[PDB]
Amino acid sequence: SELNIYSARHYNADFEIIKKFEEKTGIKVNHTQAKASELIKRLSLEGSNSPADIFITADISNLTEAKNLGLLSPVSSKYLEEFIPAHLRDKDKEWFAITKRARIIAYNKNTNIDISKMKNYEDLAKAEFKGEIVMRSATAPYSKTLLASIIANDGNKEAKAWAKGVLENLATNPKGGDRDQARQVFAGEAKFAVMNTYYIGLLKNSKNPKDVEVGNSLGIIFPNQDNRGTHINISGIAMTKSSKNQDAAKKFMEFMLSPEIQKILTDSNYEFPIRNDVELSQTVKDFGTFKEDQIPVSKIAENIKEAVKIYDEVGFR
Ligand SMILES: [Fe+3]
């Protein structure tokens, strides 16, 4: 049992990546998957005695929460610092992006839909869109971090108004993740879905013909193009403080930023690579170009508590 990974990622593409690491290094990987909230509690209760070496997330704020709970340890790697831009890794060297993703607003491009008035995140909360929006639970990392970014940019008053309006505008109570919101848009149960870009790729390229149809129907609004740009989040990685296979851990972290693995992440999981010398997959190119929010993801995550607070006060959960 040579490397223990606790991962909140939820993608079949990761199995190939793991196997590739094992074949390269001879290290066997023990892969545990659960919700980030459950992995953080588990690392908290296991403490110093945890078998965990690596914590992997699909969200910045999950990494920062683990950090701020003393659950991680710094890794100083020339390899990671050379290929990951400073804005996409912890100043204190305890977490590191492996990919980027954008949380966008999707519509059914196989319909005539006026998207002229759905340009910014704030537009989701607008009375005119009552009954026309779908979004997953406020307890989801993607949901919490998106609201954190709205607080970071617009402050808590506007953020609360936004959360209230979104709640009031939901076509249905939240059910499932991003792909279920996409299915709702395909089916005509809602006009707009808040979702991550890579799910569009996963759907368009799915083994399931029904999901291919859903994916093929989706058009992308990259919100806030006229101003601050679209919300970016990261999938990221850290060494746990509990790590006893630290050699292997640092090897795996560097491996995640290697050319072939960054290529798999965009080719097979439709995410944006962190490395600036890896070609995007054709599906990802097809999402189109867009302006990104320039706020550091670390600063977003500083507003995570107020995000959970607001969602609670407004009546989510
Ligand atoms: Fe995801």
Pair (126, 184) in one structural domain? yes
Ligand 1 centre to CA of 175 (Å) is: 15
Ligand 1 centre to CA of 69 (Å) is: 24
Ligand 1 centre to CA of 241 (Å) is: 25
Ligand 1 centre to CA of 58 (Å) is: 6
Would you mind telling me the total number of residues written for the chain in this entry?
Answer: 317
The two tokens of residue 71 are: 């659950």
Nearest to 286 by CA among 201, 224, 225: 201
End-to-end Cα separation, the chain, in angstroms: 39
Ligand 1 centre to CA of 264 (Å) is: 16
Pair (30, 94) in one structural domain? yes
Nearest to 312 by CA among 133, 60, 143, 192: 143
Ligand 1 centre to CA of 16 (Å) is: 17
Give the pairing type, strands 96-108 and 272-273. antiparallel
Pair (224, 309) in one structural domain? yes
Ligand 1 centre to CA of 235 (Å) is: 9
Q: Return d(Cα 165, Cα 123) in angstroms, integer.
A: 9
Q: Return d(Cα 264, Cα 84) in angstroms, integer.
A: 17
Q: From residue 103, how far is each of 2, 12, 81, 91, 309 by CA, in Å?
A: 35, 21, 26, 24, 21
Pair (226, 111) in one structural domain? yes
Q: Return d(Cα 213, Cα 216) in angstroms, integer.
A: 5
User: Is residue 221 within 8 Å of residue 115, measured between CB atoms?
Assistant: yes
Query: To which H or E segment does residue 96 belong?
Result: strand 96-108
Pair (189, 309) in one structural domain? yes
Ligand 1 centre to CA of 299 (Å) is: 21
Q: From residue 80, how far is each of 21, 26, 258, 304 by CA, in Å?
A: 17, 22, 9, 26
Q: Report CA torsion sign: 125, 64, 62, 234.
A: positive
User: Is residue 245 within 8 Å of residue 3, measured between CB atoms?
Assistant: yes
Half-sphere exposure of 297 (CA within 13 A, CB side): 33
- Using the structure block, give the residue that is written with the tokens 């402050």: 155
Q: Return d(Cα 142, Cα 57) in angstroms, integer.
A: 11
Instruction: Report DSSP state, residue 28.
Output: P
Pair (224, 252) in one structural domain? no
What is the structure's resolution, reported in angstroms to one decimal?
1.8
The two tokens of residue 83 are: 């290929």
Query: Quick one: residue 90, left, alpha or beta (phi over 0 = left, psi -120 to 50 = alpha)?
Result: beta
Pair (304, 185) in one structural domain? yes
Ligand 1 centre to CA of 9 (Å) is: 7
Pair (293, 315) in one structural domain? yes
Nearest to 215 by CA among 253, 251, 179: 179
Phi, psi of 288 (to 5 degrees): 100, 175
Ligand 1 centre to CA of 200 (Å) is: 11
Ligand 1 centre to CA of 271 (Å) is: 10
Pair (118, 229) in one structural domain? yes
Pair (210, 291) in one structural domain? yes
Ligand 1 centre to CA of 10 (Å) is: 6
Q: Report CA torsion sign: 9, 274, 199, 123.
A: positive
User: Bridge-partner residues for 221, per DSSP?
Assistant: 105
Ligand 1 centre to CA of 272 (Å) is: 13
The two tokens of residue 266 are: 């965009």
Phi, psi of 187 (to 5 degrees): -75, -10
Q: Return d(Cα 198, Cα 202) in angstroms, integer.
A: 6
Q: Return d(Cα 239, Cα 121) in angstroms, integer.
A: 34
Q: How many domains does the chain have?
A: 2
User: Is residue 235 within 8 Å of residue 203, measured between CB atoms?
Assistant: no
Ligand 1 centre to CA of 202 (Å) is: 10
CATH of the domain at 202: 3.40.190.10
Ligand 1 centre to CA of 62 (Å) is: 13
Ligand 1 centre to CA of 59 (Å) is: 9
Pair (133, 72) in one structural domain? no
PDB experimental method: X-ray
What range does the domain containing 251 cover?
1-101+234-280
Q: Which residues make up the environment of ion ligand 1, defined by Cβ < 5 Å?
A: 58
Pair (124, 68) in one structural domain? no
User: Bridge-partner residues for 32, per DSSP?
Assistant: 6
Ligand 1 centre to CA of 136 (Å) is: 12
